[PDB]
Subunit: 309 residues, 4 copies
């Protein structure tokens, strides 16, 4: 393609680690220290590192528990899974550590508690002082692991392509429509299931096409909402086009894009678009975002936002 | 918006770390070990951790030095900066360690343990931390832009492209997407080079253009040449002042999106000998660069 | 559904393991032995178990290397991956063990070599005497892990549904066709890519429809093969219908059925069908199986099997 | 057939084990440790491994006792047999261990290690061993049969079923698949029960039947009732003598395929309030069993 295009990161770090392991093993052999001390240091280092990761995961879970409904379907198992790996394993070594602590001969106890408290203090400093800060090489590695982090791209493409050019003149469009023939402000429907029908009527019988809007093609339709048959106001309704890409992404079947990733990114896209639109020059009192999940009547969902005006 | 929608991650981890700090300091006060030993061992532990991170970065330098020209503009300083997380904080911690000071035995032991951390993958990020990085901002746009292009314009153009090409000769058989890493694409391709001029079109409504390529005023080839639409988004973002999208960030996402689009098309069913990508960067004649791919047939 | 229908196996074994861990930890605490001996035994046991798994994986790789092209694309990395887990990790601990062995003070060496040889002998006995035999509960767990082991089902369904009822009267069909208007024996095309076109002609321009066959619907077509324009014999050609299911399985996009699993099971189905047909009463000299991979002209592939007759 | 097609796995592992045996015995002869100590420690190691496998099976008994009625016909003997791999070989090894004989300390230690083997998943099968089991024979047919039914008949019937139902009333709105675990399905449903009789059909060619259900000679409901096609395959296999497919194996795959088909339809897009599965087993009136699901609406 181009020599300036980065190739995907390989395993040079693993090769460097192999070389470093060989060099350190050779040096340790040369120094002539007993292998027992090497094994002891490795066991201690691994145990200390995993206890530090346990403390870091507990600290994160103290914050990740706040998104229990939003992120982990309200079940604690996945929240603990996503914060400190396998909870069954972690519990197994937790009980092993409790046994070790309660089985010391009391001539080693307070020293061991002192060491444990020092490790906890070091981990707390690491979290508070930010010494566990990812280098941007590692950040880039995470953000390039797979081609699924589409939420930011979809949100920004949507904004620039459509909303940056629709909203500025939309108010004038609605004004001329009202003068010639209410319907205030654009409404973007955000189904987290990302099910976008061709037209809105089959999605909800209380939403029926009324008319188009004057003035590329920029085909925006005016929809009227019926509450118990009575038309309880009308509004310009519109599905989020980029949510069609996520739906088609999962049906692609060669991307490996699952339904769970479909919902995770629709949720991320839902938040990102609001953040972009919060400070956008041409979105103040000019559009509304309606996010809903199928378990519910769409008409009432849209109607609730018209009352606030 | 909707309760299921996650809110951005807060500072609860910092509060938990503060609680842990309070508990640990209360404990240390309870035991009665003298403060100086506690402080000395704390600085020793922090110094060991920082030198271990230095070794981890040096190991990562092996991988990051292979992208010296592609990713870091042929500058070693940039590569080392990208390998070490916080140069200032690590510098301060190493300065404290130096102030507070066999010996080669523990250097090898600490290196051996760090080597096994990389090899056995013990520093792998948890899903909570993987996703936290992925939503740090709103500038990881390359993946979404590439999938939007494929699932949108490209998937519904490639399989019918060979057909419309087949009715024109009675012109290359591939769709040629130009990808300038500067993301500067004009309305048409005449301003790009004087050697490319509009010829005709190809029968929702899809508007594809034929552009004949010539050398020294003489025809030398013709193909369906079209800019990549989602580069408008990358360029328009940079001009959008309130985003904070810089040229370096724009140029980074332009490259990743270029590579991402290639992997999508590598395994795609509709891109078999149908699509060709031309990634180019002005230090240059566009016509010659495209013509190189035309002669590749 | 039905109380006689087994539910998917849960994690009762994990709960029993937790209870056993708790009981053994309590007993160890009661006995009052030093925790150091417990930690030493655990480290020794884990190291011994992983060395035993390394030896078992090496023994398997001594046989898995024989299927390098067929199974692992001719690359050793995946073969070593599929036999003994991560080879980088295994190499890391292999070098660590070499360092430990070469760093003993020569007053422990021969004892350690004796222990290592005993472990190797025990592993060799385990493999040879079959003491590492999976209980049928575990076999059922593996065979029920996911709904992808479709090869045996597809092969048997194909046999019973189609071939058991087509082959017995096919020879009579070809005989009456020849008498009324060569073409001997059924030919089943087996594309490992499982790309089944609606008709054969677009797959290969040298295969063109000639006629159907007399005598449910049982629509079998007679195809003529052209070599350099000259018709080099004709034969009853037919795609393997169950390979359409695998192709549609991967395009389903909600099953998680990847292209690699598509090829793995098509390969397994290819072998299973031959095994069924080897001893089938009505398949002796009555059908041929043609397996091919897209990198190749289909006509020559089919023609090669007509020469042998 | 084709070189890429894997051949069935041979006995190369046994040859490698023989080579390892030769090397290890040559080593033991070289060192000069007396034979009796070697043999005694070998039997001790084998006894420890066998008792560890016994503990692993006892732990697996917790999971296998929950399927006592479903999987093992309500017999404890069957469950214990299914948890322990080779009762005879383990019995012989434990007999040798008993012949060759603190003490409770090592029992807890050996149990603790076995507990962590299960909890940390250190006995997980490698991909080579996972696939070796999956191709031990050719009787793991439940997965393929279920996917063939869905991707074939079912996927192209369910979405147009509600339509053809909607044109008939001017009848239940679901397709009812009967799944007798004996795999015995007649040509039509009249022989099944006298309370089910053919009524009419529903407009490649698909032949769906309407079957009215009645009680005491009185109409009580009507629905599209049809047997599961791939149960013919399971039953026909058993009658096929050269396969070796027994009733117990047929009944095992019938159940797994029944459950497998439910998971496919649980996440399917075309089975939303469209398909209902009726798994039944004669120790019984079929009409009453189906009618229970009819009233569930
Ligand atoms: O097994 C393995 C495991 O482990 C893993 O996981 P992770 O997350 O990575 O974890 C980690 C561990 C460690 O590391 C490793 O791995 C190895 C090394 C060694 C170490 C030593 C000891 C330590 C201390 C403790 C005491 C007991 O972590 C930890 O630490 C724990 C341990 C346990 C586990 C393992 C065992 C071994 C031992 C040896 C001795 C020397 C993953 O999972 C991987 O994969 C593996 O698995 P598999 O399946 O592959 O086999
Ligand atoms: O593998 C894992 O995930 C894992 C998770 C958690 C732990 C873990 N270790 C301890 C120890 O006190 C301990 C042990 Cl027992 C042996 C050697 C050295 C040490 C101490 C230096 C830190 N400890 C105390 C409370 C809570 N947790 C743990 C170890 C793991 O290996
Ligand atoms: O984790 C893994 O995959 C893994 C893989 C391989 C090994 C591994 N251990 C040894 C040892 O001699 C050893 C060590 Cl060094 C410390 C304590 C006890 C022992 C011996 C009782 C067996 N050994 C010798 C040759 C080849 N391999 C290994 C250990 C792992 O943990």
């Amino acid at each position: 393609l181009h020599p300036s295009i980065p190739c995907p990161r390989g395993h040079g770090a693993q090769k460097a680690a192999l070389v470093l392991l060989s060099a350190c093993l050779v040096t340790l052999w040369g120094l002539g220290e007993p292998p027992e001390h090497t094994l002891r240091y490795l066991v201690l280092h691994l145990a200390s590192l995993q206890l530090g990761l346990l403390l870091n995961g507990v600290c994160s879970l103290a914050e990740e528990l706040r998104h229990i409904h939003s992120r982990y379907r309200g079940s604690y198992w996945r929240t603990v899974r996503a914060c400190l790996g396998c909870p069954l394993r972690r519990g197994a070594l937790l009980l092993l550590s409790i046994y070790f602590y309660y089985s010391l001969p009391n001539a080693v106890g307070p020293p061991f508690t002192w060491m444990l408290a020092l490790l906890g203090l070091s981990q707390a400093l690491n979290i508070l002082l930010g010494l566990k800060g990812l280098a941007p090489a590692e950040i880039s590695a995470v953000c390039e692991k797979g081609n699924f982090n589409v939420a930011h791209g979809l949100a920004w493409s949507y904004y620039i392509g459509y909303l940056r050019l629709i909203l500025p003149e939309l108010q004038a469009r609605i004004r001329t429509y009202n003068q010639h023939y209410v319907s205030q402000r654009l409404y973007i429907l955000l189904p987290l299931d990302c099910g976008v029908p061709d037209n809105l009527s089959m999605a909800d019988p209380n939403i029926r096409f009324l008319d188009k809007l004057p003035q590329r093609v920029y085909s925006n339709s005016i929809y009227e909402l019926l509450e118990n048959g009575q038309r309880a106001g009308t509004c310009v309704l519109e599905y989020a086009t980029p949510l069609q890409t996520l739906f088609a992404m999962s049906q692609y079947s060669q991307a490996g894009f699952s339904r769970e990733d479909r919902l995770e990114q629709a949720k991320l896209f839902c938040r990102t678009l609001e953040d972009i639109l919060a400070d956008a020059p041409e979105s103040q009192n000019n559009c509304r975002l309606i996010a809903y999940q199928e378990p519910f009547s769409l008409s009432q969902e849209v109607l609730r936002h018209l009352r606030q005006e």
